[PDB]
Amino acid sequence: DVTVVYQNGLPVISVRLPSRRERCQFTLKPISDSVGVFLRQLQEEDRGIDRVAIYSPDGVRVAASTGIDLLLLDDFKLVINDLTYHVRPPKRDL
């Protein structure tokens, strides 16, 4: 799976990327990082990623400008190449 865990107050997203078996974790800043920033970090991590996107649980594409704080208010789907991951963050205030 893709997991979301808060460490030292910040969300840490751990992902399996297509080109290696070792998982990679991405620490994000909810107040300043955006969806698009995180997708760019993923692509920079693994050149074997041809395509990456995030969708709502209802399957609607999430805007790249959206803050990570808003994204982590509820579940989401993370598409990496031909795999879709249902991510379930821990629900926190805002």
Swiss-Prot record:
Residues modified as S-glutathionyl cysteine: 24
Post-translational modification: Phosphorylation by CaMK2 in heart leads to increased MCU current. The regulation of MCU by CaMK2 is however subject to discussion: another group was unable to reproduce these results. Phosphorylated on tyrosines by PTK2B/PYK2, promoting oligomerization. Glutathionylation at Cys-24 in response to reactive oxygen species (ROS) promotes MCU higher-order assembly, leading to constitutive activation of the MCU channel and mitochondrial calcium overload.
Region feature (N-terminal MCU domain): 2-92
Inducing stimuli: MCU transcripts are down-regulated by microRNA miR-25. Down-regulation by miR-25 may protect cardiomyocytes against oxidative damage in cardiomyocytes.
Subcellular location: Mitochondrion inner membrane
Modification type Phosphoserine: residues: 19
Effect of residue 24 to A: Abolished glutathionylation in response to reactive oxygen species
Family membership noted in the UniProt record: Belongs to the MCU (TC 1.A.77) family.
Subunit structure: Homotetramer. Component of the uniplex complex, composed of MCU, EMRE/SMDT1, MICU1 and MICU2 (or MICU3) in a 4:4:1:1 stoichiometry. Interacts with CCDC109B/MCUB; this inhibits channel activity. Interacts with MCUR1. Interactions with MICU1 and MCUR1 are mutually exclusive. Interacts with SLC25A23.
Entry's free-text remark on domains: The selectivity filter, in which calcium ions are arranged in single file, is composed of two acidic rings separated by one helical turn along the central axis of the channel pore. The N-terminal MCU domain is required for efficient Ca(2+) uptake and for interaction with MCUR1. It is not required for targeting to the mitochondria, oligomerization, interaction with MICU1 and MICU2, or assembly of the uniplex complex.
Its biological purpose: Channel-forming and calcium-conducting subunit of the mitochondrial inner membrane calcium uniporter complex (uniplex), which mediates calcium uptake into the mitochondrial matrix. MCU channel activity is regulated by the calcium-sensor subunits of the uniplex MICU1 and MICU2 (or MICU3). Mitochondrial calcium homeostasis plays key roles in cellular physiology and regulates ATP production, cytoplasmic calcium signals and activation of cell death pathways. Involved in buffering the amplitude of systolic calcium rises in cardiomyocytes.
UniProt name for this protein: Calcium uniporter protein, mitochondrial
Originating species: Homo sapiens
Record lineage: Eukaryota, Metazoa, Chordata, Craniata, Vertebrata
The encoding gene: MCU
